[PDB]
Amino acid sequence: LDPAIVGDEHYRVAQEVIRILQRYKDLQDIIAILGIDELSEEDKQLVNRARRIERFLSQNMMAAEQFTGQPGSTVPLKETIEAFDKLTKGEFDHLPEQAFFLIGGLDDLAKKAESL
Amino acid sequence: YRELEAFAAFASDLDAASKAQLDRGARLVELLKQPQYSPLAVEEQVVAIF
Amino acid sequence: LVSVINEFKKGFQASDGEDLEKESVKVRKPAP
Amino acid sequence: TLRELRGRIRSAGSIKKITKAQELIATSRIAKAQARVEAARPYAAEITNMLTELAGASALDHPLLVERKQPKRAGVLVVSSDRGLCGAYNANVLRRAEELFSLLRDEGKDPVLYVVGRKALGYFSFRQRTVVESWTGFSERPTYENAREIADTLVNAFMAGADDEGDDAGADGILGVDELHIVFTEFRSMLSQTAVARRAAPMEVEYVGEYSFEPDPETLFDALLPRYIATRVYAALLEAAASESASRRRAMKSATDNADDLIKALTLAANRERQAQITQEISEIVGGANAL
C-alpha cells in the first residue's frame, strides 16, 4: 500500500477510513457511559458515519451456503472504491440501520433501501 | 501546549493568550511532520524552525 | 394456530394493569 | 487475572478524561448563563417604579389584592431541570417541596401541584399524586412566551375560584385555587446555592411612611399586574438554570478526582499479581530443574 505503485484515491480512502475507525474506537466507551447527548455536532456526525462504515464492510460469501440460504456475492474494485468514497463523503448517512447489513453491492444496497 | 490542549479540547471561550498559545503549539506539531526517504540539510531546517 | 391464538388472547384477561420571602410594593405615602 | 484489570484501567481513564471534558463544558456554560441572566434588570426596575407610582394614589382593591374568605385549597409550582448529573439539586428541590407540603397539611387543605422538568415529572408520576400540567424541553433555554402563558394560566386558575363555596364551583363552574406558591433555587454564590420558596399570590400593601392619569387608573392597574406577574415568572427561570449549572460543575469535578484513585489502586494490585506470578514461575522451574 503506497501511492507510488497504487492510485492515490485508494491511499486517501484508506487514510480517512482508518482515522475514522481510530477516533471511533477511542470514543466507544465514552458513548457507552456518558451517552450520545453529551457529544458535539461534529462528534455526532462522525459517530454516525463510523456506524455506517462499520456496518457497511460486511458481505456474504459462497461458503455460507451450507450455514445460511443466501448465496454469496462478488464485486469488482472500481465500484467498491467509488462506493467507499461516497460513504466517507457522508452522502449516504440518511440510510437506515438495517440497510447496512450484509451488503455486497451498491445495487443490492439500494434494493434493500427500497424494501424498507 | 499539551498541558493546555488536553484540557481545553471542549472549550469555546478561553483566555486570548491561552488560545494563541494553543494555536502556536498545534501549528508547531503540524509543522514538525516529515515524509520518508526525504533527508534534510541544516540550513533549510534552520529556515523552517525560524 | 394464529386464529386460536387470537381467540384465546381475546378471551384471556390480564391480571395486572420562615424562609418564605414576600415581595411587596414601595409607596412614598406616609403610613396611615 | 490481568486482562480484566487492564480493561478496567482503560475504562476508568477514559471516564476520567471525559468527566473533566464535560466539567469544562459546564464551566464554559456558566459564563454565558451568567451573562444572559443579568439583562432583564432595567425592565423589571421600570415595571416596579411604574407599579409603585400608579398604586401610590390609586384605589386599593383587586381580586388578587383581596383574599378569599375560606382557605379551600392552595396551588403550588415547583421547578426542576431537564438534565441529570446535577448532584443533590433534584434532592434539595424535592426535600423543599416535601417540607412545604408537610407545612401546608397543618391547615387540612387539599392542594394541587404544578411541576416543570422531566426528572420531577417521572418522580411524581411514580408516586401517588395528581399533576394537572407539566412543562419540559426548554428549562435549559427558556423564552418570555413560556413564562407569559404560564402566568396567564395560573392567573386564570386563581380567578376561577372566586365563589368556590364548599364543593360547589358556583358561577365559575370549575373548582379554583385560593393560594399559590413558587419554589426555585437562588444563586447566592458560586458555591452557595440555597433552594428558596416564596408565596406571592395575594398582594400585600405596606406604607414605608413619609403626574396625570389620562386613561382609567383602575383599568391601567388591572392590566398592569399581569405583566408584573409574568416578569417575575420569567426572572425565576434564568436564576434556576444558573443554579443548576453551578451545582452541575462540582459533582463532575469530584467524580474525576475520585476516579483517579481506582486507577492507582488497580495498578498496584496488578503489579503485585504479576510479580507473584513470575516468582511462582521461576520457583516452579527451579524445583523442576534441581529435582533431577
UniProtKB/Swiss-Prot annotation, chain A:
<protein>
    <recommendedName>
        <fullName>ATP synthase subunit beta</fullName>
    </recommendedName>
</protein>
<comment type="function">
    <text>Produces ATP from ADP in the presence of a proton gradient across the membrane. The catalytic sites are hosted primarily by the beta subunits.</text>
</comment>
<comment type="subunit">
    <text>F-type ATPases have 2 components, CF(1) - the catalytic core - and CF(0) - the membrane proton channel. CF(1) has five subunits: alpha(3), beta(3), gamma(1), delta(1), epsilon(1). CF(0) has three main subunits: a(1), b(2) and c(9-12). The alpha and beta chains form an alternating ring which encloses part of the gamma chain. CF(1) is attached to CF(0) by a central stalk formed by the gamma and epsilon chains, while a peripheral stalk is formed by the delta and b chains.</text>
</comment>
<comment type="similarity">
    <text>Belongs to the ATPase alpha/beta chains family.</text>
</comment>
Swiss-Prot record, chain B:
<protein>
    <recommendedName>
        <fullName>ATP synthase subunit alpha</fullName>
    </recommendedName>
</protein>
<comment type="function">
    <text>Produces ATP from ADP in the presence of a proton gradient across the membrane. The alpha chain is a regulatory subunit.</text>
</comment>
<comment type="subunit">
    <text>F-type ATPases have 2 components, CF(1) - the catalytic core - and CF(0) - the membrane proton channel. CF(1) has five subunits: alpha(3), beta(3), gamma(1), delta(1), epsilon(1). CF(0) has three main subunits: a(1), b(2) and c(9-12). The alpha and beta chains form an alternating ring which encloses part of the gamma chain. CF(1) is attached to CF(0) by a central stalk formed by the gamma and epsilon chains, while a peripheral stalk is formed by the delta and b chains.</text>
</comment>
<comment type="similarity">
    <text>Belongs to the ATPase alpha/beta chains family.</text>
</comment>
Swiss-Prot record, chain D:
<dbReference type="GO" id="GO:0045259">
    <property type="term" value="C:proton-transporting ATP synthase complex"/>
</dbReference>
<protein>
    <recommendedName>
        <fullName>ATP synthase gamma chain</fullName>
    </recommendedName>
</protein>
<keyword id="KW-0406">Ion transport</keyword>
<comment type="similarity">
    <text>Belongs to the ATPase gamma chain family.</text>
</comment>
<dbReference type="GO" id="GO:0005886">
    <property type="term" value="C:plasma membrane"/>
</dbReference>
<keyword id="KW-0472">Membrane</keyword>
<keyword id="KW-0813">Transport</keyword>
<dbReference type="InterPro" id="IPR035968">
    <property type="entry name" value="ATP_synth_F1_ATPase_gsu"/>
</dbReference>
<dbReference type="GO" id="GO:0005524">
    <property type="term" value="F:ATP binding"/>
</dbReference>
<dbReference type="GO" id="GO:0046933">
    <property type="term" value="F:proton-transporting ATP synthase activity, rotational mechanism"/>
</dbReference>
<keyword id="KW-1003">Cell membrane</keyword>
<dbReference type="InterPro" id="IPR000131">
    <property type="entry name" value="ATP_synth_F1_gsu"/>
</dbReference>
<comment type="subunit">
    <text>F-type ATPases have 2 components, CF(1) - the catalytic core - and CF(0) - the membrane proton channel. CF(1) has five subunits: alpha(3), beta(3), gamma(1), delta(1), epsilon(1). CF(0) has three main subunits: a, b and c.</text>
</comment>
<dbReference type="GO" id="GO:0042777">
    <property type="term" value="P:proton motive force-driven plasma membrane ATP synthesis"/>
</dbReference>
<dbReference type="Pfam" id="PF00231">
    <property type="entry name" value="ATP-synt"/>
</dbReference>
